[PDB]
Amino acid sequence: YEQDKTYKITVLHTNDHHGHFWRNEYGEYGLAAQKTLVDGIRKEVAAEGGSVLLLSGGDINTGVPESDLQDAEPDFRGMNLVGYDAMAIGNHEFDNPLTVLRQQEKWAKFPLLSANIYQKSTGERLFKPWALFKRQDLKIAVIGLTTDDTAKIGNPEYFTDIEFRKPADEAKLVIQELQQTEKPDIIIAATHMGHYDNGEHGSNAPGDVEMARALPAGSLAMIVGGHSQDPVCMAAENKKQVDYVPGTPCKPDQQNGIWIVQAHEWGKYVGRADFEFRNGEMKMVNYQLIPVNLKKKVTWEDGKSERVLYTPEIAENQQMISLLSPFQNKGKAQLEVKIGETNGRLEGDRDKVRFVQTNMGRLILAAQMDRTGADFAVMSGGGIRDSIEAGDISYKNVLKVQPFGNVVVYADMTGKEVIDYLTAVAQMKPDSGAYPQFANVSFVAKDGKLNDLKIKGEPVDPAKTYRMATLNFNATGGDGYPRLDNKPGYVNTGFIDAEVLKAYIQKSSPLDVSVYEPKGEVSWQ
Numbered sequence: 336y337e338q339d340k341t342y343k344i345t346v347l348h349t350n351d352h353h354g355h356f357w358r359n360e361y362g363e364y365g366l367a368a369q370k371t372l373v374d375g376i377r378k379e380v381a382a383e384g385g386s387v388l389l390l391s392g393g394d395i396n397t398g399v400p401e402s403d404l405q406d407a408e409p410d411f412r413g414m415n416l417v418g419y420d421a422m423a424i425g426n427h428e429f430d431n432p433l434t435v436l437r438q439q440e441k442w443a444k445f446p447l448l449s450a451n452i453y454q455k456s457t458g459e460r461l462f463k464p465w466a467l468f469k470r471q472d473l474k475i476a477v478i479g480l481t482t483d484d485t486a487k488i489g490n491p492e493y494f495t496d497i498e499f500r501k502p503a504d505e506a507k508l509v510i511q512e513l514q515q516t517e518k519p520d521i522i523i524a525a526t527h528m529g530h531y532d533n534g535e536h537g538s539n540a541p542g543d544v545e546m547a548r549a550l551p552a553g554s555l556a557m558i559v560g561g562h563s564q565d566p567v568c569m570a571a572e573n574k575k576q577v578d579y580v581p582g583t584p585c586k587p588d589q590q591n592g593i594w595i596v597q598a599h600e601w602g603k604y605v606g607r608a609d610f611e612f613r614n615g616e617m618k619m620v621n622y623q624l625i626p627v628n629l630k631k632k633v634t635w636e637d638g639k640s641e642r643v644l645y646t647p648e649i650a651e652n653q654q655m656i657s658l659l660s661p662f663q664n665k666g667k668a669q670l671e672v673k674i675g676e677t678n679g680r681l682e683g684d685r686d687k688v689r690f691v692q693t694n695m696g697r698l699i700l701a702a703q704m705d706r707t708g709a710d711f712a713v714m715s716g717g718g719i720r721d722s723i724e725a726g727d728i729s730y731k732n733v734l735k736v737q738p739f740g741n742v743v744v745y746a747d748m749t750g751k752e753v754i755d756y757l758t759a760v761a762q763m764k765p766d767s768g769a770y771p772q773f774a775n776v777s778f779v780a781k782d783g784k785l786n787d788l789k790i791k792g793e794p795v796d797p798a799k800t801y802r803m804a805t806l807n808f809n810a811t812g813g814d815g816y817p818r819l820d821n822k823p824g825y826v827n828t829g830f831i832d833a834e835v836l837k838a839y840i841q842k843s844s845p846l847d848v849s850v851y852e853p854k855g856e857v858s859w860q
């Protein structure tokens with residue numbers, strides 16, 4: 336570089352897009368608004384002589400029907416128009432077969448990066464480990480890393496010949512290689528690993544903090560993350576603010592000299608890290624999370640309430656709208672067809688389905704047993720992606736709750752196998768996607784044993800067999816559930832979760848929430 340010269344670098348970032356290419360019902364976020372905000376930042380940055388690097392922390396796939404139904408094509412194309420420079424491959428990029436991810440890479444005009452994903456049979460990387468950028472006299476390298484929890488929590492069949500090596504360990508190797516061969520002035524890691532206060536990842540694979548702490552001091556200017564889906568704004572050292580408020584200051588985390596940032600989720604913010612480089616020192620001169628048309632609720636004493644923007648409205652870029660419109664409208668009428676109605680809200684929020692039994696769980700499972708003639712049922716709470724509210728229900732509503740495209744399957748097992756299976760599944764505690772959801776089952780589980788085990792209300796008869804219904808995911812060992820696909824009575828019906836659910840609600844409508852209310856038949860202790 337040039338001695339005594341000050342260089343300006345602005346790093347913009349988003350992560351966990353999850354198919355939100357379109358603004359939401361309240362006019363929030365969307366890529367058309369993101370386009371405008373970023374074009375605007377590019378102009379200010381260029382007028383000052385700096386350069387912009389726009390990075391994604393991954394998890395573009397799954398989360399909005401119109402996106403899901405089309406393999407996030409609208410999302411990846413929108414990203415080309417916004418002008419992303421690189422992206423870290425996220426675990427949900429493995430929600431579809433690999434050919435889908437390969438098609439997404441063909442769509443993306445920016446590289447999809449990951450240094451630690453390897454093909455088992457060859458010991459070679461499935462993706463590029465980094466991209467290089469030459470800006471003025473500087474060379475910037477961006478490494479990509481993917482959480483090694485990807486296969487552990489994902490569809491077993493996709494990973495038979497794929498391994499996710501430890502991200503932190505790969506990061507050590509890649510950085511050293513870069514320093515030895517490319518000699519970048521700055522290295523940034525885009526990662527899909529998670530920010531856990533003080534490195535307290537608990538049950539989750541270790542993420543950004545632990546990695547920053549294990550790498551050589553200042554070896555990365557910053558880590559642009561994702562996965563945990565948090566706005567990384569510190570309330571105190573090693574403690575993120577809870578209920579971060581859009582528009583307020585956001586102090587990014589810094590560990591072992593390495594900044595760590597995250598822009599929450601779904602295009603809600605575009606983070607902006609403003610750096611100055613001079614004679615080797617990298618100074619972050621400003622950091623903020625820019626809300627993309629986020630709104631708050633204001634409530635008047637007359638009881639009326641309305642949605643008000645935190646910051647000046649950002650206009651939707653029309654070229655983006657023109658690009659995304661066809662994808663947004665493809666089959667709209669169908670998705671929005673009324674298929675039924677519910678007495679009340681069907682609890683489907685992670686905080687619930689991941690910790691306690693809920694009626695959405697009873698509902699989905701009811702749909703599944705009914706279609707399979709099953710006596711009892713179970714699914715991963717991590718399979719319930721959304722709740723359903725009182726009122727009409729559209730197919731779109733359902734594709735929002737179950738977006739993975741899982742298949743409903745059943746197993747006819749001896750009461751013997753039943754107890755053994757339920758005992759196993761019951762061993763997975765709350766705060767996990769592997770958490771269980773039950774229907775027509777009950778017990779007083781204790782110390783790993785199943786006390787007072789029953790199916791529908793009658794104890795388990797070892798001699799008698801029973802039919803259990805679930806998804807292929809769980810049946811194949813997803814969330815580490817006991818493999819059912821390679822044992823005695825097992826059947827894959829081919830019926831897609833969403834479809835089975837749609838059908839079941841069309842015929843069972845009007846839905847009476849009281850019928851699906853858990854009463855504590857499952858308890859543990």
Ligand SMILES: Nc1ncnc2c1ncn2[C@@H]1O[C@H](CO)[C@@H](O)[C@H]1O
Pocket residue numbers: 429430488489490715716717718739741767768769808813814
């Ligand atoms: N391909 C998939 N099919 C079904 N459920 C999935 C899939 N990938 C992840 N999940 C669910 O999401 C959780 C992680 O958010 C997993 O523990 C699992 O319950």
Ligand SMILES: [Mn+2]
Pocket residue numbers: 351353394427562564
């Ligand atoms: Mn995510």
Ligand SMILES: [Mn+2]
Pocket residue numbers: 394425426427527561562563
């Ligand atoms: Mn993720």
